Design a protein around this ligand. Sequence first.
Ligand code: HEC
Ligand code: HEC
Ligand code: HEC
Ligand code: HEC
Ligand SMILES: [Ca+2]
Ligand SMILES: [Ca+2]
Ligand code: NA
Ligand code: NA
Ligand code: NA
Ligand code: NA
Lengths: 357, 354, 376, 376, 125, 129
Amino acid sequence: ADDALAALGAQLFVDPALSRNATQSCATCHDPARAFTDPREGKAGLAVSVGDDGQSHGDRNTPTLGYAALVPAFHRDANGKYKGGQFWDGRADDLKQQAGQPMLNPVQMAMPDRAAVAARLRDDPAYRTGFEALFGKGVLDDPERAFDAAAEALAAYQATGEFSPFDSKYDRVMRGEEKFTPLEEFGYTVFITWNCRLCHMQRKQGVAERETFTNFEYHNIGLPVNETAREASGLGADHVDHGLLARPGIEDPAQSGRFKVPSLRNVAVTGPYMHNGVFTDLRTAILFYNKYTSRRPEAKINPETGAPWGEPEVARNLSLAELQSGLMLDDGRVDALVAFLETLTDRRYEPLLEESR
Amino acid sequence: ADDALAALGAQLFVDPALSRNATQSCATCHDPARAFTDPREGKAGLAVSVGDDGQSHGDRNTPTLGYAALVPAFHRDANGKYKGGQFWDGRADDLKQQAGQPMLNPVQMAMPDRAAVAARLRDDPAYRTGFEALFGKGVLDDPERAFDAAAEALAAYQATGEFSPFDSKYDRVMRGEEKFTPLEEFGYTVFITWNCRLCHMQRKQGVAERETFTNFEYHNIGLPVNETAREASGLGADHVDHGLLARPGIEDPAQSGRFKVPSLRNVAVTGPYMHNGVFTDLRTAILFYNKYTSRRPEAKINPETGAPWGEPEVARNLSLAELQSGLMLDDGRVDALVAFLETLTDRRYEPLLE
Amino acid sequence: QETQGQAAARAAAADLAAGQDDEPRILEAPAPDARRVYVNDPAHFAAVTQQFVIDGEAGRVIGMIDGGFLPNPVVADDGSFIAHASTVFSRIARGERTDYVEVFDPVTLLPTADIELPDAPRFLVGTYPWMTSLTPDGKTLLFYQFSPAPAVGVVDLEGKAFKRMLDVPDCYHIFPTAPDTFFMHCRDGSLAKVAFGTEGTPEITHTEVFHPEDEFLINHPAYSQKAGRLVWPTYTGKIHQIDLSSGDAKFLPAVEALTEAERADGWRPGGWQQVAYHRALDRIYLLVDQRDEWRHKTASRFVVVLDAKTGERLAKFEMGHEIDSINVSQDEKPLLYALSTGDKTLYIHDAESGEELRSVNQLGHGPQVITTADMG
Amino acid sequence: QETQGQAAARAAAADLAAGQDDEPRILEAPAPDARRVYVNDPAHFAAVTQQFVIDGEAGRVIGMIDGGFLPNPVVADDGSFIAHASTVFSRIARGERTDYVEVFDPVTLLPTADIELPDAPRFLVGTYPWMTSLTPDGKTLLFYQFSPAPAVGVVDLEGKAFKRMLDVPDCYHIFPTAPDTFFMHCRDGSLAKVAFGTEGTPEITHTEVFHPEDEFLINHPAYSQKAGRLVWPTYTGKIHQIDLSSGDAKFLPAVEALTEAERADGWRPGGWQQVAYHRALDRIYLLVDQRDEWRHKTASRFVVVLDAKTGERLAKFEMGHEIDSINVSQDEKPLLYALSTGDKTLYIHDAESGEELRSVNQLGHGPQVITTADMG
Amino acid sequence: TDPRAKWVPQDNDIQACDYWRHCSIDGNICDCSGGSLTNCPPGTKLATASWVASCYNPTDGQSYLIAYRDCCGYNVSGRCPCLNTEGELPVYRPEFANDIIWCFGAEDDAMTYHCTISPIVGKAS
Amino acid sequence: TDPRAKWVPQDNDIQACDYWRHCSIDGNICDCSGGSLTNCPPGTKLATASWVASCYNPTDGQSYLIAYRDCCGYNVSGRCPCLNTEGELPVYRPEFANDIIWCFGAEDDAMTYHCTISPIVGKASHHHH
Ligand code: HEC
Ligand code: HEC
Ligand code: HEC
Ligand code: HEC
Ligand SMILES: [Ca+2]
Ligand SMILES: [Ca+2]
Ligand code: NA
Ligand code: NA
Ligand code: NA
Ligand code: NA
């Protein structure tokens, strides 16, 4: 059942018959050889992904599915902070609610509706057999059931150890099986004593058993629009990605421009970075944080463009308290952080670090 | 010698033959019955005194001679403060140098010069005998020796116990013979803990053998002109009394407007007060100090005139560090001070306290 | 048995073992209650000072307020706010002086008002609690000025503004009785009643003279604004009680806190805050020991408790320490707070038995003044 | 053996008997000289602090200087002035921060300059002498900034104006060597030489890395500006000596302050100002004791004295008190100053014999830094 | 009591200087002025900066990273002063240095030192 | 060191709280922070205000008026703290009261307390004391 449901999800995940033109499976955008992100080039580089029509681009960067199964379901905590959920704006409560959305999105897999999905599942005798064993006879005749079941299988598959193996060097080091290089060790010390820890650690204090390097909260760190992405997505020059406020049922204008803190696991191999893929290099993402702290003019310039970072897409609700730490990361500490973040790469993706290094 | 000298000075002191018209003696203005001050009402009341001619008024209040003999000779001390001498502006070095000035001052005794003084001395057989015994035969035929000798006798007389008897209640109390009243004691405690002791005590610390309630310094306390006195004096309404600066040899502009701190001995019976007799009452003199301390309307008004005190005659060099003490004398402390000050009255003038 | 630090170690270990997360944050002080006590440390005339807010029940510091030069603390009896009149200088102890009033929220301890007093008008003196005083409505703070002459300043806490200085005769201390009236103690031996409108010289009314010139009334009388009771010991432990509840002064029978044979064997009050008054118990507490005539600011090792209406001694406690200042909580079963300037320790006593319950040490440099709210 | 207070009583008694008058007034301190010593009291991080100006020969406090939060004292080696970089706030420890430098006349102790530092730029740290430093000419004061990044602030004492901040690498401490140059110690184990103008990117050069990553160099190296000698102990009592007198760094041979057998038996330096250097004698003094390896800020009871050239031990003094800081007068027959933070006492020792000669107690709350002028 | 002896952690009293989490604290324990082990007193402002030490917990045999944080904007408390330096490195390794007033990031720009908290942020490695 | 016993003046050590002239001193002996018995330390400002006391001098058996004066404009010295109260009267008799910061008249408006001097200003006997 647990095994079998995931095994079904495994099959669906790679099955392009879930896209209108049959060109695209989850695996196409969440490619297992790329820590489940999209290696494909589109009109905005790797910032945003192309759908099954071959033309439609999204407005956000395809995130890893690695460790996404550790994220709690979306909720508001007692301190009025939203946490968890799926999608950069948390608009899906959890993996199961998320799974069906790329299928029906005309900018992604573009199936017209649930019935079209179920017709596809019915065409395949392995699916009749697999779905029926788990969900019962005729499940694939009922589009609502078939679609829900396909989401469930896909959520199950993403909860397997294959997606969250905890076998990064960092994991190995925390087991006592090996040691950090001294650069990695300094990186870890910086990470845990600087402001990164205020957002990129599961817990406020104490020790997490399955650390994924995010507190699953929502923060506006004051990123600019990714203009090439925004052009490709076609959403308009006057469009504002309001982040969490876009989630249905969120009305508080203080949530405007806030996005889910990503897990930094496999961060080294899942560029480009941020919700709009705006920064191509990991070092850039780190340096962006100096804009709140450094008094040096260079701290205001995106090193990838040589131009100012740009006005925030959403100039209000910035996390200034956390961001304005009073301390600038010098290059040695940025280098250290890169080294440390690379230790968060799963064992099987270690060979990918060669090219990024 | 010392007795006999003083005894000659005693004769001279009361002798009006040392004035031009033979109408005026030292004792006319320094009346022994009024603690050697002038009881005579002139133009400007008692603020200033009239000379031998019946019409010339001075521009300063006639001071007591009591305890003048305890003032050091004029000198500048090592802190740069001038101290001592005689007259309100210290322009005389000492008693001896002071004594001949009234004799020759046309506004006072008005003798034409020293020879006229000698001649009057030769008119009196008693003086030929008295001066000759102390200073030698022919002293009176030499105007300079005669005048210096008269001045010496006058000074010696003023150095007698009679002028400085230290028999005030204050003296008796400090000998343990008598106690202050509670009000007098409060007044003394206020006197020595308030700014008054910064100027009206001989020493900065320790105890004086012969306290005369003056440090002998020069201070500008910021007094206004006494308009009627000034009128009567005939010095002009443009005139400015520069106090110590008027002493020859003092050039330091910082000394303008500064006057010698008077001994407060006998102060209760020597009104009017200050160098120009501008205040008739002792209470007023004490209240004057509140103008620097008190932020109440009353403090700005001379209670004898009902009008503002007046701008200082000399606005510069006020002793503000001393005068702006940060504390105002309430009516109670002013009463206590009056009472304390009355204790500095010599025994013989205690009857004058009403 | 288990101390505060121990209990905390155990709770922290449990949270660790359980995997319990918690957000590091700024704590709120527990709500003000009757057992809250404030200890002010004038720090032997240091330029900056500290006030300790203490939960008397647990004997725990629950917060602190920083102050300037010889600040005058006040605590609103209703617990709604605390305030001080304080003095700072632009360069530690030199330079431009700023006198000001701060009002603080009693649980975040954040300043909610900061009201400058013009012309540096505060009286700088070892801390006498009744040299700065809240009116009963809490709307007005009155502070004493000595220089150039006795005066009283009126500060509007509601409008957050200084209003004006009242000219008074030669009097001391400020015991507000109403939104527009307070009493003072005058040199001539009267109390003066000062009624201030919004304008004009106030109206001032002397009581009879109520003590002779050679009877010395201490700088730290107790005053219960809610009871109207002014409790004023003299050097010999004689105690004037003055009732101001009616709006006018009426003088309660004078009382002696020590017996003749005690007097004769050298017992005298001594310390700083020598006297405490418990309003509901109508009871007086006096710090005493055997001492010379002129050692009246020294610590004492005993407290006598006496009934306010009779004069009857109710207890004599051996404090077991050198105590400079006393006060009491105004609840039922009150604590008797015994502050040792020398030990920098507030000893917290059961006011009934005099037993030492607990203590809070390390209370600054020279703590002297204990304040409580009368919240009941 | 007659104490100063006895001598003073004797003299006052004689003036009274003799009728001798004297004007009460403000004293001038005696002229600065080699045996003047300054003790700074950071007062364990209090908002306000004190410096004591001491006559080391007489063991007399001859003056004091008030300061704000963790001020950095400097003393002009020629005796012409003293200064500090200080920090005050508008409401004791809260509100608007003002950092400033004051310069004082060394006899009247009056401030002759008060120079504001814009944007509150001082590094707030437990006091390290070499985190604020005078250039040899006395005209410039250099102060370290940590936040947002290591930087060094330049203050013109002659013009009484703040000049600029300099951006530096990831380095610490300021050892000036010239009117426009100073050295710093870098995270990477090098020294950084910083040469700066009125405007322009400062010229920064690093030496070779002179210690391994795991050899830890203490925060309180001794630096003799007149000798250009930087004497930098490690935690183990290994002593790096760096000669900066040429204007570039030369590394001198390392010496051990402790023997192998001592080190095998747990001897290590420890304290605050653990090391002193006497220029004329070329001698290092190091506070050491038997201690665990991580008790390196604890007091020590021994001073080893060693020849800086050869590393030969000349003495091992049993100080007889818990000493946190040492320094020495820079004259002949120097005094060895041994400051106890816990006893708030400066013990003054003959530096040749180690014998305690006298002591000055009541030096604040937590005195930690001794400064002397090198006037010779 | 022997200041120079090896520090011996305990996990039974947070107000004592040998409390295990305090192995590199410098200042005053916040628990003693109205804060708590990992929270600041009222009126003070919590810094975001920290120093770190690996402190052995004798309750569980594990070493934890304690990332000290200062509570700022008040004069020093004066209660429960402690100075420990386990693993404490000099100022040039500032993440392990403890003479620095780590008040950075505190609200209202507060930079005066009041006391320090001792929260755990990970296991030592 | 019995704090409550009758105070016993000595004329042998001015830095000790039992020095005869300190009979009503409150604060710190100026002589311990760089002043002298009767002069203020450097940097401080001498007040013109005083409270007075009559202090018995064991040496001559005379009683002298000591008009204590504060030296102001510095934080309290912290050395040789002393509080004595011979003849000390409460604040409403301020001339003899010693909790008051007697800094009035000090230059620069200095009103912070540093230490106190003990000069003689007269011979004595007060009705009280
Ligand atoms: C056309 C590319 C594309 C395809 C195909 C696609 N995804 Fe995604 N995926 C994205 C993008 C883009 C986002 C972020 C969108 C957003 O935040 O609004 C995303 C977000 C998610 C997330 C949220 C992860 C996070 O951390 O917030 C999950 C889970 C997910 N995808 C799973 C799937 C599954 C399961 C399939 C197939 C059923 C799938 N995706 C197909 C591009 C794709
Ligand atoms: C105030 C909370 C907060 C702080 C502090 C912060 N982060 Fe982030 N970080 C985020 C959030 C939120 C995002 C996603 C922002 C977005 O895309 O809108 C993010 C994104 C990133 C990314 C891109 C990851 C990806 O998959 O695209 C990196 C790398 C990262 N942060 C590193 C750091 C480091 C290193 C520090 C310390 C210098 C740090 N962060 C501090 C909230 C924070
Ligand atoms: C016309 C009235 C008058 C007569 C006559 C007179 N004096 Fe004066 N006396 C004064 C006045 C007025 C002053 C103050 C003058 C001044 O300060 O310039 C004074 C001042 C003095 C002083 C200085 C006192 C002090 O404290 O400064 C002495 C001494 C003195 N007189 C002695 C004498 C002697 C001796 C004679 C007789 C030779 C004499 N006076 C005649 C009016 C008089
Ligand atoms: C700054 C020094 C100073 C202080 C302080 C001072 N005085 Fe005077 N006082 C003087 C001087 C000078 C005079 C004469 C002024 C003049 O006539 O120009 C004087 C005059 C007087 C007189 C008039 C005496 C006479 O013979 O005319 C009285 C009375 C007096 N002072 C009392 C006091 C009292 C009481 C205090 C304390 C409130 C006091 N003074 C404070 C310097 C001082
Ligand atoms: Ca990415
Ligand atoms: Ca007169
Ligand atoms: Na782009
Ligand atoms: Na919404
Ligand atoms: Na007139
Ligand atoms: Na002249």
